Ligand binder design. Structure first.
Ligand SMILES: [Mn+2]
Length: 654
């Protein structure tokens, strides 16, 4: 049972430096409220809400999901209903979950191993660690603009961040060594490395909604959560119940109009790391990305839909997988294994302790619901939580791939390719086979970014077993992996793009198109608002919203129903607004096109560049620095001197 501490306690007090921003953060209470969907327009505006009500009914009606029995998609490309938009963007379900403080039991109760099952697996994992963290080229420590440093200073002034980051890369060794001696408080008080994660709550504005033919009433997807007790005890006591998306309280409290079939939005937990501890970790994680997005680009680097469609055309079978709640599930033991191999490889113990510790840190829960929260979970003096993986750890994306890639590969050997076992006899042979399999220069294949992936089998012996596996995944009775809960994706798609099979449901005559539902989400149910209160747009969550219209075609036009939907959209946006959506959007576009230039027409920019500028969160799951124009990059990022990261990195590696 995890130690808990009220905001009042000395232990949580020193999470928050002596200034307003920081103190405000320790204290900050629940906050709901309509979002400025677009400039001058509220998410709960009676017209906008009526627009949604009709657009979703009509679209789900005239274009029902065309999805296979094996979760392959065909026909119109619609993988589901359009009811997503039926949320009161800004008003959150209540309560949000308390971050679970130990997944040890969660994993057990799920039948997932507490470590590698077989020495083979133990080799493949360690191989991944080797191939990932070896032969690294130093780069600048690129700092995202606008981002917070969280515990302890809670600043978001680039100048301050640069200084902290540089300072960190200096005294990072001193601190790691201090952690090795077990003096974590000493390390934190001297270098603000340790302490805790800061538990914000992100919105996810497009969770599931269904329309019961029986009921005729709408049905929000149930989303379970943990009351404090459940979370501190990893599931022993406490209860795990569903939160209320019921949006009526919206009327009572704020007098707002609540149409039939609208709900509050799902809220996922998000963590914010002590920047001073992420700095030394990012200086390494970024190079690692570089090595893999190049050398092992077949399985890891994903840009354009051709780039995807190409690799898959060659496959004889394609299986889109899916991972349940990947993050709260991430094995604690993989961290310890990854940390061992690093040590073995010769990585400097101190830097591994920073890494080890960054994955065992207490989390500070802010505001799950009104009158809940303001609590530190676990003791910063001796960090030992098993949160799983934390959204804001320096290497969090790599941590998902390292795990999940091997997990899949194993799943392939396990059910399709036993004859490759001979190939993995020892460490060296392991890498060799891994280094092979990761380039896709092998008969079983994989493209993946952490929890999203598609698995492929070329012609060959495995090919038959592959099909067996597909079947095991359809019946969904047996879990194929011992490491994570894995299933097929009902409506197969990879990194935002839908795989559109055809008449012959074969990966050859398949083609990647974009998800049309995603467009409707981006355009009408935005994560954040326009932030007019914020002056510098590069500091805003959506800097140049208009710009997305420019890349609409270059992105969604590939969809079977793209045209119709643009016409449906335009139509309904008339019945509700009198105006013309196309005009409204073109009006936004022209505006921000001028505005943009003070921060650097669009002749130059790429189709991506725009999507990024309209929402830079797509650097956080979709694309990468290499994918964006180097001059557009400096608008959303600023780095730390390369001299400084190079010297640092030189002390870390072997
Ligand atoms: Mn998928």
């Amino acid at each position: 049972r995890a130690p808990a501490f009220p905001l009042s306690d000395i232990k949580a007090q020193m999470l928050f430096a002596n200034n307003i921003k920081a103190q405000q953060a320790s204290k900050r209470s629940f906050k709901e409220g309509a979002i400025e969907t677009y400039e001058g327009l509220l998410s709960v505006d009676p017209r906008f809400l009526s627009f949604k009500n009709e657009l979703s009914r009509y679209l789900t009606d005239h274009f029902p999901a065309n999805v296979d029995e094996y979760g392959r998609v065909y026909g119109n490309g619609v993988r589901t209903n359009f009811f997503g938009m039926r949320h009161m963007n800004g008003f959150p379900m209540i309560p949000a979950t308390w971050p679970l403080a130990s997944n040890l039991k969660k994993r057990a109760d799920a039948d997932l191993a507490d470590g590698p099952v077989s020495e083979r697996d133990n080799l493949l994992f360690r191989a991944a660690v080797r191939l990932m963290f070896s032969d690294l080229e130093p780069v600048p420590l690129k700092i995202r603009k606008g981002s917070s440093t969280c515990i302890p200073y809670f600043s978001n002034d680039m100048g301050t961040k640069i200084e902290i980051a540089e300072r960190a890369l200096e005294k990072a060794e001193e601190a790691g060594n201090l952690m090795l001696q077990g003096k974590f408080d000493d390390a934190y008080q001297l270098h603000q490395m340790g302490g805790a994660y800061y538990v914000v709550y992100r919105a996810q504005s497009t969770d599931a909604i269904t329309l019961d033919p029986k009921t005729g009433k709408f049905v929000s997807k149930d989303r379970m959560v943990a009351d404090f007790e459940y979370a501190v005890t990893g599931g022993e006591q406490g209860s795990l119940f569903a939160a209320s998306k019921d949006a009526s309280r919206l009327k009572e409290q704020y007098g707002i109009d609540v149409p039939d079939g609208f709900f509050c939005e799902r809220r996922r937990t998000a963590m914010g790391g002590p920047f001073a501890l992420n700095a030394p970790i990012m200086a390494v994680a970024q190079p690692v990305r570089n090595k893999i997005y190049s050398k092992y680009a077949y399985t890891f680097h994903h840009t354009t839909r051709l780039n995807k469609e190409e690799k898959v055309k060659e496959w004889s079978l394609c299986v889109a997988t899916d991972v349940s709640d990947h993050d709260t599930f991430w094995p604690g033991w993989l961290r310890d294994l990854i940390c061992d191999e690093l040590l073995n490889m010769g990585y400097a113990p101190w830097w591994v302790k920073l890494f080890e510790t960054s994955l065992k840190l207490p989390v500070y829960v802010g505001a799950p619901a009104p009158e809940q929260g303001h609590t530190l979970l676990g003791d910063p003096s001796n960090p030992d939580l098993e949160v799983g993986l934390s959204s804001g750890q320096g290497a969090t994306d790599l941590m998902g791939t390292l795990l999940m890639s091997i997990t899949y590969l194993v799943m392939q050997l396990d059910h399709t390719a036993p004859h490759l076992n001979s190939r993995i006899k020892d460490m060296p042979s392991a890498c060799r086979f891994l280094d092979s399999y990761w380039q896709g220069h092998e008969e079983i294949r994989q493209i993946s970014k952490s929890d999203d992936a598609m698995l492929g089998w070329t012609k060959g012996r495995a090919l038959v077993g592959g099909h067996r596996l597909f079947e095991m995944l359809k019946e969904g009775k047996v879990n194929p992996s011992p490491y994570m809960k894995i299933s097929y994706q009902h409506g197969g798609a990879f990194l935002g793009d839908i795989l559109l099979y055809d008449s012959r449901r074969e990966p050859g005559s398949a083609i990647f198109v974009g998800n049309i539902n995603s467009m409707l989400n981006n355009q009408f149910s935005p994560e954040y608002g326009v932030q007019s209160g914020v002056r510098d747009r590069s500091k805003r969550k959506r800097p140049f919203p208009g710009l997305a219209w420019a890349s609409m075609k270059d992105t969604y036009g590939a969809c079977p129903i793209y045209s119709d939907v643009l016409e449906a959209i335009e139509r309904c946006w008339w019945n509700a607004f009198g105006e013309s959506y196309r005009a409204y959007r073109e009006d936004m576009l022209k505006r921000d096109t001028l505005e943009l230039s003070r921060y650097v027409g669009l002749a130059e920019l790429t189709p991506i560049d725009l999507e990024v500028l309209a929402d830079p969160n797509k650097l956080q799951y979709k694309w990468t620095e290499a994918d964006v124009s180097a001059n557009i990059h400096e608008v959303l990022m600023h780095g730390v001197s390369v001299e400084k990261t190079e010297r640092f990195l030189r002390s870390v590696m072997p």
